[PDB]
A paper describes a structure:
Mitogen-activated protein kinase (MAPK)-binding linear motifs bind to the MAPK docking groove and represent a functionally well characterized linear binding-motif class. Furthermore, for extracellular signal-regulated kinase 2 (ERK2) the protein–peptide docking surface is comprised of a small hydrophobic surface patch that is often engaged in the crystal packing of apo ERK2 crystals. Here, a rational surface-engineering approach is presented that involves mutating protein surface residues that are distant from the peptide-binding ERK2 docking groove to alanines. These ERK2 surface mutations decrease the chance of ‘unwanted’ crystal packing of ERK2 and the approach led to the structure determination of ERK2 in complex with new docking peptides.
Parallel to our trials with pepMKK2, we attempted to crystallize ERK2 with two other peptides (pepRSK1 and pepRSK1_SQAA). PepRSK1_SQAA is a mutated version of pepRSK1 in which intra-peptide hydrogen-bond stapling interactions were removed by replacing a serine and a glutamine residue by alanines. In order to grow complex crystals with RSK1 peptides, we used the same sparse-matrix screens that were also used for pepMNK1 and pepMKK2. However, apo ERK2 crystals were always obtained when wild-type ERK2 was used. Surface mutations allowed ERK2 to crystallize with diverse packings and some of them were compatible with docking-peptide binding. These new packing arrangements were indeed more ‘relaxed’, as expected, and this seemed to increase the chance of growing protein–peptide cocrystals. In addition, the bound peptides (e.g. pepMKK2, pepRSK1 and pepRSK1_QAA) were not involved in crystal packing in the new cocrystals.
Residue numbers in the entry:
A (entry chain B): 712 to 727
B (entry chain A): 11 to 178, 186 to 359
Write the structure that this text describes.
């Protein structure tokens, strides 16, 4: 339930 | 076999350690351990063979999920069922295990604007792929958006999906149904998914469904209470001037500006919300347009936003086959997961 940062996602990852 | 809340879950010896997650009318969902691949999975027991509608729903979901390959769409890892048609009384769908859904999350968690923005990009990204195959999901809602703590989002539950056709059944909730469905539309247009998405966005912004009607007319009354009474052109774009009379019977109401609801929302989210929840489906923002909205600029990337290879096609009309036929189709459709299939 408590969310980790967006930066964890691999989709979000390929945004850097 | 293992028994979960009194029911047989005949998925061993490959799948073990089943733990109940949730329930619907003809299906139960458990977490499990795949000993062959050594991963945690989710298993859905579905027992739809008593009713035509369940059968057809199950076949749609199967065919579509097996046809789609997308990061933001749940897949089907495996399907277990008996070796003869006479023995097949249930079907087990093995999927990737997700941690929660948007519905269960919004219960206990205020989202931050960052999460909202990124979840919405993900939905629309999955939706673009869906719409590009010419498929309508038609039942988008928070409980159909699966999530992880890593913040990955997958769209699931395509039991009501169909091929778009403007213009030559129904549902648990009307809460996410586009107004045109109560009036003049079968919901064979891509604009109906967009409306659902707007409803979803509104719910992340405030943690409550924006249009929680209790029945057909009430649903409309909720929608119009925010969107205001429609313009004469939005009217009589109707394919029904005899429920239009019903519309006329209602007092004029004004459009409650989106900043009065959601006072703290980001102006760009509210603006995209306005464009997704427009009464007239024809004036409603499309999937590519929405992705390109300034609210989603950080994640917007056409080159990493996959599109279907071809339109999907059913080939048989499912709505119109008897459950016996549908059971047979279900059997043949799942044979590819059986040992020794050719
Ligand atoms: N692959 C999965 N991983 C984790 N949870 C899942 C998965 N699939 C379904 N669920 C959950 O199982 C529960 C409901 O499953 P489901 O049988 O689809 O309910 P329903 O009445 O059929 N559809 P819905 O109206 O969207 O809840 C929910 O708690 C979901 O979060």
């Amino acid at each position: 339930p408590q969310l980790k940062p967006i930066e964890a996602s691999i989709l979000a990852a390929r945004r850097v | 076999p293992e028994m979960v809340r009194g029911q047989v879950f005949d998925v061993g010896p490959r799948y073990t350690n089943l733990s109940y997650i949730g329930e619907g009318a003809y299906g139960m969902v458990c977490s499990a351990y795949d000993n062959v691949n050594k991963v945690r999975v989710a298993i859905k027991k579905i027992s739809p063979f008593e009713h035509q509608t369940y059968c057809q729903r199950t076949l749609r979901e199967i065919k579509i999920l097996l046809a789609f390959r997308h990061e933001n769409i749940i897949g089907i890892n495996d399907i277990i069922r008996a070796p003869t048609i006479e023995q097949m009384k249930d079907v087990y769908i093995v999927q990737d295990l997700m941690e929660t859904d948007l519905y269960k999350l919004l219960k206990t968690q205020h989202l931050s604007n960052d999460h909202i923005c990124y979840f919405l990009y993900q939905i629309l990204r999955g939706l673009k792929y869906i719409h590009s195959a010419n498929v309508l999901h038609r039942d988008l809602k928070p409980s159909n958006l699966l999530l992880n703590t890593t913040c990955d989002l997958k769209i699931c539950d395509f039991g009501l999906a169909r091929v778009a056709d403007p213009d030559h059944e129904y549902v648990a909730t009307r809460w996410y149904r586009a107004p045109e469905i109560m009036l003049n539309s079968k919901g064979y247009t891509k604009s109906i998914d967009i409306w659902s998405v707007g409803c979803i966005l509104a719910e992340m912004l405030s943690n409550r469904p924006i249009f929680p009607g209790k029945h057909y007319l009430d649903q409309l009354n909720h929608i119009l209470g925010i969107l205001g009474s429609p313009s004469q052109e939005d009217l009589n774009c109707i394919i029904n001037l005899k429920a239009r009379n019903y519309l006329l019977s209602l007092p004029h109401k004004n459009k409650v500006p989106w900043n009065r609801l959601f006072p703290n929302a980001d102006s760009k989210a509210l603006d995209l919300l306005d464009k997704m929840l427009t009464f007239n489906p024809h004036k409603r923002i499309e999937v590519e347009q929405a992705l390109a909205h300034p609210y989603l600029a950080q994640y917007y990337d056409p080159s990493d936003e996959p599109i279907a290879e071809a339109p999907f096609k059913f080939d048989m009309e499912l709505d119109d086959l008897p459950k016996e036929k549908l059971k047979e189709l279900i059997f043949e459709e799942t044979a590819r997961f059986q040992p020794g299939y050719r």
